[PDB]
Amino acid sequence: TENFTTNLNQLARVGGIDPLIGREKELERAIQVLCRRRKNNPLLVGESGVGKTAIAEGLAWRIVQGDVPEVMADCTIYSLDIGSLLAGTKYRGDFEKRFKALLKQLEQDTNSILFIDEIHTIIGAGAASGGQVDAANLIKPLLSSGKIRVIGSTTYQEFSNIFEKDRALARRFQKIDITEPSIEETVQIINGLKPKYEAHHDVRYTAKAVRAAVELAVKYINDRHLPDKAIDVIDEAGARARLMPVSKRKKTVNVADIESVVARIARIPEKSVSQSDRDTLKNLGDRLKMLVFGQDKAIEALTEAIKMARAGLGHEHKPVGSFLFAGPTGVGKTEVTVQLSKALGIELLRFDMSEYMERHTVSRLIGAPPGYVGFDQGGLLTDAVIKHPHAVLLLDEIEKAHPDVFNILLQVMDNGTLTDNNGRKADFRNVVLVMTTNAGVRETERKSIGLIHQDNSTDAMEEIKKIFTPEFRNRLDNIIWFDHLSTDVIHQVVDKFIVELQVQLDQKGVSLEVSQEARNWLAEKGYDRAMGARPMARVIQDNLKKPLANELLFGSLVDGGQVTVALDKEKNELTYGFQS
Amino acid sequence: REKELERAIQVLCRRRKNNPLLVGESGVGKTAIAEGLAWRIVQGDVPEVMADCTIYSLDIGSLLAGTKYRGDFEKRFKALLKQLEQDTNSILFIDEIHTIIGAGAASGGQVDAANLIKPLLSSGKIRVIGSTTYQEFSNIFEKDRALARRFQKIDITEPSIEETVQIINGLKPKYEAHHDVRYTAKAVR
């Protein structure tokens, strides 16, 4: 029978179980419940990682040191193993024999206590072919009688949905709700456990490192409770140091190592940015300007907002940024966002809001459609953010989306979190939200039927106000109005489109060199203010790609290149010369 | 895959909850990373602490099959833990770990493989290298917050074009011998 039950008090003598710190009120109630003449069976109900298994085992630990009342002294605690109890019980009566034999020794001792971890498993432990004979029905008369004392442990999900379904078994137990300790209490717990973790990794943890692990975990590590969250960062930090090369090995765990661990656990950038990343931010704006010509104000808003986040000046309850890039066509509202992801090397979450025109399809970002029993549930936007917390979230053509989509982004832009239907929470604190719309292009473009031309370019904002609710616009960090491309800007665009063409030709081995005068001709021919810079692509396609297409497939341009493009002033037309 | 592995060695060198989970998409090398860790040990391309370690690949299908009894599953599964508990260096590679959360053997009960390994994983007795997809990680896994706590997710991202050509060059001898062909360097790119 000893194979099924492990004496926890023995482990305490050799140090098998870690010490329990605090929990004076939680533990005290357990003693009161155990002392009870009747129904002396406490139940430790709490979320995962809140010390449910450290209290029952910690009680045994306290007994060895004599830090418990005289009544609790001289009382051993046994931990039951359901797996061993149900091992090789094929024949009828085997399980009952093992279970009843255990209960008999407990009643005889009169000072023994049983600890059943994950007690939700005894409901149907011994049921066979629909049989109702289970550990719960067997133990029941011994709990109601009060002969034996049993300590339980189960999560709220399991307790409410499985353990509390049997209204008889639950009556016998006494739920002791355990609440996660405060930040102040958690650091004390780490100090108590720090000697064991320090010995295992042969490292020393600075007092500042302990406080940082707790404070940083809450700030960044979500979906896990504080005692586990902090111990996870501490244990992982020690391993990182122990296994790195002996040369440059550092026994002490400075506060900087803690920050690096939290970053990898949460997949976010680390605090106290390094010199290498500092160079990226210094030249982040100047790199985008090379790719995107004009509209520097937009780049200044994105880069400055990112710097604040990486400098510790963030909102702490909102995303890195929320910018509504409202502007005319072909002004670089989407190019800057696609290049930003490349510049920062972070995943680009691109959502085309043209699809989400009606409410039935808007429930795909936070949940699954009704009746979708398929296991592939979850929102498209919540799952994506969870996979990549550091990323760029682009919602193109946000105006086309049903107005109800603006209500979803309110919490994202104010609280920084969006919850899935299942209850999972996504953190937007590191995502650069960017929206692109053409709400006011027509209004400003609109001509005025009057003797005096109207002072346009003001009504554009008034149209944006009508499309977007005031609450949505208040949360926004800045509404960037993209201006129209000028003649000088278009010249740079032609260069940008020629470089891309050169790259395509480089794959085939062809080399292209456009005369500077010829580039000016292309720019003037295609320059359109209303159509932005997209027409420049078309003139590049008609003037250059169309003639070369026939030559590449057949002719001198099969390989070798040696192209020489120039224009004729007399004819105002291009001259293409290929010599392999 | 030294950046991903290094993280896994850190998790496997922990006092408690030393069970690295290789979460990722489908086809991004989740299984190879775990089986690769064994290949690297044989050649001595791993730290000293990781040396003298064996990786066991669990087969839930074979284990569950043939039970036909109340305690057959528990008997064979518990015996496996004794082997892993006695051998401190033994590591268990449970591929498609999402399956253990669902009742493996139990029917109308909660005595599953997941609820049996939780006590051992919490105390650091045995290490477990799990592998699961992102869709399975969200909807099958993470529904039992207790088990998810024991496992430290290690996101595995798709490799770049340049990184993959190195991979093909590494695996080119295996396919060359099987097909008796020679893949040109330009062809793989």
Binding site: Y91, R92, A128, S129 | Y69, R70, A105, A106
Partner: peptide
């Protein structure tokens, strides 16, 4: 499923 079998020893 989980069925209990009663064995019979030889006489």
């Amino acid at each position: 499923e989980k069925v209990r079998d009663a064995l019979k020893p030889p006489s």
